[PDB]
Amino acid sequence: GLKAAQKTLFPLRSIDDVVRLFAAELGREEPDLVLLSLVLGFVEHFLAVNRVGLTYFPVADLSIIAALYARFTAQIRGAVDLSLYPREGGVSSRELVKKVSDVIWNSLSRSYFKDRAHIQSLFSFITGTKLDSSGVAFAVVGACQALGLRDVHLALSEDHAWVVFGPNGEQTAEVTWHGKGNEDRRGQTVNAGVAERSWLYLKGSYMRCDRKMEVAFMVCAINPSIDLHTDSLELLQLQQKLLWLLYDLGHLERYPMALGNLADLEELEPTPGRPDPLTLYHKGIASAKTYYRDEHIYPYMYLAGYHCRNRNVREALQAWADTATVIQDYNYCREDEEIYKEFFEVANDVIPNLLKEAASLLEAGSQGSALQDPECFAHLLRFYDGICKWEEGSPTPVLHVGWATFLVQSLGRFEGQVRQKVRIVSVPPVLTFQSEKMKGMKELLVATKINSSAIKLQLTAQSQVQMK
Numbered sequence: 001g002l003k004a005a006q007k008t009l010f011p012l013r014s015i016d017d018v019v020r021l022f023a024a025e026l027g028r029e030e031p032d033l034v035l036l037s038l039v040l041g042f043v044e045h046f047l048a049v050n051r052v053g054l055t056y057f058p059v060a061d062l063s064i065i066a067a068l069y070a071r072f073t074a075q076i077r078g079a080v081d082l083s084l085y086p087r088e089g090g091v092s093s094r095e096l097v098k099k100v101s102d103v104i105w106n107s108l109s110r111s112y113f114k115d116r117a118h119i120q121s122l123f124s125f126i127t128g129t130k131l132d133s134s135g136v137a138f139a140v141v142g143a144c145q146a147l148g149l150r151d152v153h154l155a156l157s158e159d160h161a162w163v164v165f166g167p168n169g170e171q172t173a174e175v176t177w178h179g180k181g182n183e184d185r186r187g188q189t190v191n192a193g194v195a196e197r198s199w200l201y202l203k204g205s206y207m208r209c210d211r212k213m214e215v216a217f218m219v220c221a222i223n224p225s226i227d228l229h230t231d232s233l234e235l236l237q238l239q240q241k242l243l244w245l246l247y248d249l250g251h252l253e254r255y256p257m258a259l260g261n262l263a264d265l266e267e268l269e270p271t272p273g274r275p276d277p278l279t280l281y282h283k284g285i286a287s288a289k290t291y292y293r294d295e296h297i298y299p300y301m302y303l304a305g306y307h308c309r310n311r312n313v314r315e316a317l318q319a320w321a322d323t324a325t326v327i328q329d330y331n332y333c334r335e336d337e338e339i340y341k342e343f344f345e346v347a348n349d350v351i352p353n354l355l356k357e358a359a360s361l362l363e364a365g366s367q368g369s370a371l372q373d374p375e376c377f378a379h380l381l382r383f384y385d386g387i388c389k390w391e392e393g394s395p396t397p398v399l400h401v402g403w404a405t406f407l408v409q410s411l412g413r414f415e416g417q418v419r420q421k422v423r424i425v426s427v428p429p430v431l432t433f434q435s436e437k438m439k440g441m442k443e444l445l446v447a448t449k450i451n452s453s454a455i456k457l458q459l460t461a462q463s464q465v466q467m468k
């Protein structure tokens with residue numbers, strides 16, 4: 001409206017007052033996305049962007065928040081004339097969705113750094129005329145709610161955002177950009193991307209948010225970073241509390257990434273009486289298995305990251321193998337470059353550093369070392385197998401000789417007597433390879449001294465050696 005009942009908790013004088021507001025909105029028919037995003041952006045501004053004069057919490061006065069809200073609703077109502085776009089069935093049309101998208105887009109500053117922090121919220125849109133990529137999609141959904149368009153909802157993959165709308169909520173529309181230097185498909189469906197089996201569209205197993213899940217998104221979007229070295233404890237606490245509220249009300253049930261975020265926040269600062277981070281990462285993975293065909297990568301990455309930081313090398317390797325086991329059933333497409341980077345860093349930086357330390361610890365007499373555990377070698381092999389299988393049938397290759405050097409080094413961290421204990425079984429520790437590259441590498445995986453040149457040839461399917 002704002003409606004009288006939405007105004008009664010103001011002023012918000014603390015983290016807990018903001019939690020109160022979220023609880024009240026989540027108990028309504030429809031939580032007010034515009035109100036909530038403006039409040040988070042206000043408090044994030046004064047806790048992370050400009051802390052000058054801060055003494056405890058930046059009090060959110062109704063007059064201030066109501067005037068920002070009025071700025072937003074005036075901008076959207078003035079620019080989108082609904083009479084031009086009749087709604088039959090009480091559902092929206094593609095032209096209406098595109099118009100709202102255009103209005104948001106056309107309001108943005110002509111030039112700014114798109115991956116800056118703190119440009120995710122409606123506070124940023126109103127006060128700075130700046131939004132990040134997914135922020136634009138969220139703003140479209142907020143604007144649509146403000147206009148009464150109950151059918152328009154946020155859609156989220158692991159690296160992009162768009163909307164769903166229309167009869168049965170079955171239509172899709174691009175509303176925002178993706179990446180850097182990919183050309184807009186604003187207004188179009190996501191069906192080509194789904195059909196090509198790219199990671200970006202998750203084979204169709206992407207989140208279709210309800211209003212509560214859109215609240216969860218804006219909560220995950222909070223950015224406690226003050227600078228590279230420093231997070232706002234106040235924003236960490238607020239995000240954590242808001243995620244527990246959502247969790248308790250059931251609104252994280254279908255939101256794997258949110259459960260990973262909450263697990264990471266609990267690792268940093270555990271809440272007494274709550275599930276441990278590991279339980280939460282596993283809930284994230286179970287959510288992806290239950291609702292999204294186990295076609296998400298980040299539930300496993302989140303888990304691997306935790307094990308890595310805790311130097312549980314076996315369990316980290318297991319979880320990265322599981323990431324690869326998901327990616328293997330995708331085609332590597334243009335605009336998947338974020339997940340390629342993730343896999344590259346794991347294979348070529350993280351795993352090497354971990355195994356380097358494990359090697360030094362083994363020299364110092366360690367027992368139960370991953371490097372002496374054939375099931376850990378099997379995980380390493382399953383990780384490469386999934387990456388090789390991913391590559392098969394993709395329009396663009398994945399592996400190159402730069403990966404080969406690290407593979408050879410990583411393999412060699414395990415002694416031959418350990419590697420010999422993995423049984424590689426064919427269809428039709430034990431491991432089955434899905435990729436042709438690893439099936440052909442079987443021959444070389446158990447020699448005392450790894451034949452480096454042969455491994456390079458097999459991984460990159462470079463077929464010739466130097467002439468002279």
Ligand SMILES: N#Cc1ccc(OCCCN2CCC([C@@](O)(c3cccc(F)c3)C3CCCC3)CC2)cc1
Pocket residue numbers: 133134156157158159160161217220221298301302303304305308342346
């Ligand atoms: N090992 C390991 C490891 C590697 C990577 C990793 O990533 C964890 C964080 C994943 N990241 C995925 C993208 C995501 C995010 O950019 C995102 C999510 C979905 C769609 C979208 F367009 C953007 C933010 C979610 C709230 C505001 C945008 C933010 C979180 C965690 C562990």
